[PDB]
Amino acid sequence: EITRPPGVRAHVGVIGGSGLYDPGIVENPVEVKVSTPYGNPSDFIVVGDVAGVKVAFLPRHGRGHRIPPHAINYRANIWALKALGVKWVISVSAVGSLREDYRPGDFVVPDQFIDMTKNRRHYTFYDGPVTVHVSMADPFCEDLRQRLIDSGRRLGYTVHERGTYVCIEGPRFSTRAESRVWKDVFKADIIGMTLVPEINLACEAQLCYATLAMVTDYDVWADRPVTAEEVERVMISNVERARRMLYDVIPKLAGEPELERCSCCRALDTAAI
Amino acid sequence: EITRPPGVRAHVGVIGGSGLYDPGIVENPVEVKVSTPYGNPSDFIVVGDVAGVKVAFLPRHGRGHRIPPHAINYRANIWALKALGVKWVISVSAVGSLREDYRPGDFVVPDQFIDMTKNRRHYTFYDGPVTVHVSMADPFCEDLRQRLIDSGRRLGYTVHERGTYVCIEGPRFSTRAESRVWKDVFKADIIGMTLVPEINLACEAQLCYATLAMVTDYDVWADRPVTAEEVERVMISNVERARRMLYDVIPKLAGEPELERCSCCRALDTAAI
Amino acid sequence: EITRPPGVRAHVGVIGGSGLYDPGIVENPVEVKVSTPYGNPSDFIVVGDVAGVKVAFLPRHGRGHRIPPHAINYRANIWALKALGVKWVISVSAVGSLREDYRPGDFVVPDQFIDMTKNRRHYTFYDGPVTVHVSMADPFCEDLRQRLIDSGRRLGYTVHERGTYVCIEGPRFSTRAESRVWKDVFKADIIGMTLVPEINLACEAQLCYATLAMVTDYDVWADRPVTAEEVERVMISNVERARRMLYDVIPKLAGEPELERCSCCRALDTAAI
Ligand SMILES: Nc1ncnc2[nH]cnc12
Ligand SMILES: Nc1ncnc2[nH]cnc12
Ligand SMILES: Nc1ncnc2[nH]cnc12
């Protein structure tokens, strides 16, 4: 509603690490405060120009990785992006792999998820009196998934074109017994902590949201189990490739998502009672 | 404790949609406010006579479907019914089907459930200093299940006599990956959002509770995934059949549940420490 | 930080029932209040000497079993033990069995767990600005597990040397449909309510924690389902054997845990961002 500075708008939102913003590319960056009914987003939003497209960058963990997955104000974050006018949301996330062929350093563009979170407090924007039940059979925006996959291929990177993400509560990593359940029983492909309720909220806000996941580790299945320092190290080693993909895709998002390939773009038409 | 008007009592409680109350049948309806230690129930309770049996009707979502499943004051709702003296609780619920033979428009009287909720805040009435752990191996009241099945058969409706209900958090519907887990891995039959913690609380209150579920949709498994508007439409089309069953069963509930076919009727004898 | 009386320290913590403290063994017991940033622990901590080793005893449910599993202040409890200087934590817990060969009266020293809790509110000590993700692939302290198994064998008791614990929310016990999932789908061995988030927090605090579980019942799988009164009765019948094991093991804990057999002893080195 109120922004400071006033009158700022953007077309594409990027949620992820602070390292994705590059001041050498983004023209006329401005730090923006956006009012939300839920209080503070994770940090200031940075708005600037990439090849003529206005982009809003939000670090989900805050600058300096100050906010763990369970403590993020997911409602404020998605509200703020929607208030700025964005239509496309690219989420960039680190994930663990549950399969030998999805290797550290590969990208995955997932198509499904399983929510095993417990403690996120709000899974919706709609607490009444209008009851809203969005259909999430196909929860990601296909228009954007396909654009991410094409970019990655054109740049020569490995991009797995499907994947089921199991979202766990954390902040601790899985036990071996849990990981066996995710991999052998649920048949999930990748594991992370931040997708839910971010994706739920993006869908309710009628955004075209997709995830670009970067595999950082093999969970408990290698010689050494995952540690936080390994995730950060691998991520920082490869953020350059994620940046190159982002600066390739964003100019192609000057237009609107195609309704027939955006499951959430008109979610509220059929969802509200 | 305090009611307004004072001195109101009832024998049978019905929890479900507002459309189930029929002013053409119910004699001498009175809207009742019932004090609870947990604040407001979903709405006023309507108490009236059906063929000489006193019935209390509570719309779980409130009149006008104002309260989504995660925001319902389950403790207040079950406390209020217990305070009015009810022994039998018929819950009427819309569910999705995970099996081709449980079709839209069929009734199901489930016998088991799996709780996959996350965000309901209170799963019990007993937070100490008396610790209570009720046994819920057979969580529904068999005496009432059998009466519902008999009514449905006598009226010529399809009533499936068993079923495992998976209760999910919502308000969003399942992904395809989640639905595959419910159906293929957990082997659940029907899916809904409101059973838990309603059933837990009913058991702790020593009520004979059973669910009459109406199948409204096939979840993600048809040509088109479930939407909220489809659920409401199918429900409203068939509420007439649910009403006919209710007005058939209620006169037969003039007596008491049989202890040997009411697993929760003496739950607290063995549950309290 | 502040203790009353001041200057109290201990080396070994025991978490479990009040019946484990034996005033005939423990020399110079003192009831201690320990300040925590999270408010009150379950009860006073009792500190005393067992064969020259200083031991702190905390009843997790409080004296008189006043606090059910979902209402325990897990953060306060583990903070208080850490503030007293303890290095070893022996948790004693009642569990249900999901397998015929783990019989009522047997001990189990589990090696894995699966968290199916929902409502414990805090799963970590670290809410930012330092984000901490501890690795819990092998979540129990092996040094202590092996010492418990050896004690039990030397005293002639049955001690199962492995086991996956599924931790459920409660306070109600499982349905038959849920229990089938735990046993047949997840392949868990034992079931209980109190392990999580106690173990998470112990790991973050760099404690060597292990569970000595006592099987009290077969969940829903016997002729009669588990009840609370059966759990208490079986527990109290066998607490004498648990006491004998504790007074055998504690003198052997005069030293420090071996780092190579203590997965959490240096958890924070690699976990903090
Ligand atoms: N193995 C893993 N589990 C959960 N979240 C992760 N993020 C990165 N790697 C992960
Ligand atoms: N498919 C479905 N999933 C969950 N709750 C429902 N209620 C009605 N249909 C449902
Ligand atoms: N069957 C059971 N389920 C859960 N917690 C328990 N504690 C003891 N027996 C149990």
Coordinates of C-alpha atoms in Angstrom, one line a residue, chain B residues 99 102 108-114 140 145 160-166 187-190, chain C residues 177:
Chain B
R99 CA -10.9 -44.5 -5.2
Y102 CA -16.4 -44.1 -4.0
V108 CA -19.3 -42.9 3.3
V109 CA -19.5 -43.8 7.0
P110 CA -15.7 -43.9 7.8
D111 CA -14.2 -46.2 10.5
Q112 CA -10.6 -45.0 10.6
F113 CA -8.6 -41.8 10.1
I114 CA -5.0 -40.6 9.7
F140 CA -15.7 -43.5 15.8
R145 CA -22.1 -45.7 12.5
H160 CA -20.1 -47.2 1.8
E161 CA -19.8 -48.9 5.2
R162 CA -16.0 -48.4 5.8
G163 CA -13.3 -45.9 4.9
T164 CA -10.1 -44.4 6.1
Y165 CA -10.2 -40.5 6.2
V166 CA -7.0 -38.7 5.7
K187 CA -4.1 -46.5 1.4
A188 CA -6.6 -43.9 2.4
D189 CA -10.1 -43.9 0.9
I190 CA -11.4 -40.3 1.4
Chain C
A177 CA -4.8 -46.9 10.4

